[PDB]
Amino acid sequence: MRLIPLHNVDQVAKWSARYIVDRINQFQPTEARPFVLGLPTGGTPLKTYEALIELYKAGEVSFKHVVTFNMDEYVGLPKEHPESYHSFMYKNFFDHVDIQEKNINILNGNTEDHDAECQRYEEKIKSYGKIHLFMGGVGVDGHIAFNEPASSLSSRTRIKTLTEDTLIANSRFFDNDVNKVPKYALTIGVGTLLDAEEVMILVTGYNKAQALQAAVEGSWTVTALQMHRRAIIVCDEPATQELKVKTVKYFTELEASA
Amino acid sequence: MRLIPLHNVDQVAKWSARYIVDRINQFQPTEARPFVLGLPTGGTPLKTYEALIELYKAGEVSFKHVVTFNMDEYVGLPKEHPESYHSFMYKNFFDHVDIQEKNINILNGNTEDHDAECQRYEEKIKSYGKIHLFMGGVGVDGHIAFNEPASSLSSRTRIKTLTEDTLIANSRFFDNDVNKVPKYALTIGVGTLLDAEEVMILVTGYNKAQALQAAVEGSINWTVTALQMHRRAIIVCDEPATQELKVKTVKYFTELEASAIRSVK
């Protein structure tokens, strides 16, 4: 596992966006051989998407032959609703880069069969082979996406009931009314994330300090990253408050070395 | 508890020596009212003694009315032996400062009764009231002086067997022979150290990082964790000793003690 200890959220956004762009330009995707990218939502990914747009506007990268898969989506909320994950991804990223609609994949939470929709997504992932880079966040309790904190490492795409903690957090997006937050969501599994060639986790904020410590130092779903072949965690200084001094010191020198 | 996170061993030596001198000059000791100082041995205390000698030669401090009590001493080893803690204290400190012979107190490991000698030592401490400042080190496993790892917090001065790990250590001082290291020592107890008004522990080196973590962050357990129940405990460390502490712990004490960090930077 690689830990990138940066100072602030802006540096985390710029570094993570630059890492994605560098890999896409190293890969050089085509119509026959696209670059497959897993994508999250939320406040911390939002700053990366803004930085990715800045690099696109600078002519530094093209998403024409980039295929994307998003982590999750609300059930029962129309995709046209402003607070859907479809709306988040288009409003904050897709509408500003040269991505192709047919290469965009976001789970549909309003199908005739939620179980069937989840398996279709898993098969669309397999049809491309593997995801080359899956970007994600972590929750305060170390949970990935909408998977339960204690999800099996083999878990796959499925429907989940939102916990009481996720409803009150996401309530700010729904007029500060917990009864307006969708009660269900479709979410990729932990096994779905680990099947990617690379996982990049963005961890910012004091409230994520225990999660980052569990991810980096502990033996908390995010701890499964320790057995992943190519795991990258990009954090800011407040997120490192629970790490040991020697841990931050070693990775701070390792990155300055590159 | 205070943690003084400094950069290197020299700064730990200079700061700890300056702290001792400042307290002595703040105390203003006399014959009737002496300053009582507890003293350890070893490589890390040695640099503090060297720094204290420079401050004495500069006219910054006098030890004329300072009474000292050492932590421990080997049993069965003559005090004149080069590896006794008598020889360590005189060669590296007492022979270079203006301390008075009658104000020096070191456990005698060759008396006719080890229990009586230890009780006399405790009584001698009590006759002065309290030790005003007890300087000490810590072992890699958190032990203090020669107290066993699971020593009682109320334990007093007594004769003790050196642990197997203490026996393999210190073997370099006795011809690289574990069988030639003295098997017993007289040592102050954990309660004896805790009775002092103030305790200052010197913690340097990567090998002491686990010990510092137990002392500063761990729950009371590691004899050094007994410092957490003391009224005024001070730990002076260098950067390698902090490697096992949490970032927020070093961050907190670097800002809190920023004036003490700047004084030797």
Numbering used by the authors:
A (entry chain A): 16 to 234, 239 to 277
B (entry chain B): 16 to 236, 239 to 282
The authors write:
In bacteria that live in hosts whose terminal sugar is a sialic acid, Glucosamine-6-phosphate deaminase (NagB) catalyzes the last step in converting sialic acid into Fructose-6-phosphate. The enzyme NagB exists as a hexamer in Gram-negative bacteria and is allosterically regulated. In Gram-positive bacteria, it exists as a monomer and lacks allosteric regulation. The monomer folds of both HiNagB and PmNagB are conserved and resemble the E.coliNagB open structure with seven-stranded parallel β sheets surrounded by eight α helices.
PmNagB crystallized in the P 21 space group with 4 monomers in the asymmetric unit, Matthews coefficient is 2.16 with 42.6% solvent content. The structure of PmNagB was determined to 2.3 Å resolution with the final refined R-factor and R-free of 0.20 and 0.23, respectively. Analysis of the crystal packing reveals that the protein is a dimer. The dimeric form also corresponds to results obtained from Size Exclusion Chromatography experiments carried out in the buffer used for crystallization (Sodium Phosphate buffer containing glycerol) and in HEPES buffer with no glycerol. The residues in the trimeric interface are also conserved. It is important to note that even though PmNagB has 80% sequence identity with HiNagB and E.coli NagB, with all the active site residues and most of the interface residues conserved among the three deaminases, PmNagB forms a dimer and not a hexamer. In the Pm-NagB dimer, the dimeric interface is conserved. Even though the trimer interfaces are conserved, we do not observe the interaction seen in the case of HiNagB and E.coliNagB. However, the calculated trimeric interface stabilizing energy for PmNagBHexa* was only around -33 kJ/mol. Here, the values with less negative energies refer to poor stabilization, and values with higher negative energies refer to better stabilization, showing that PmNagBHexa* is unstable as a hexamer. We propose that Pm-NagB is the evolutionary link between the monomer and the hexamer forms.
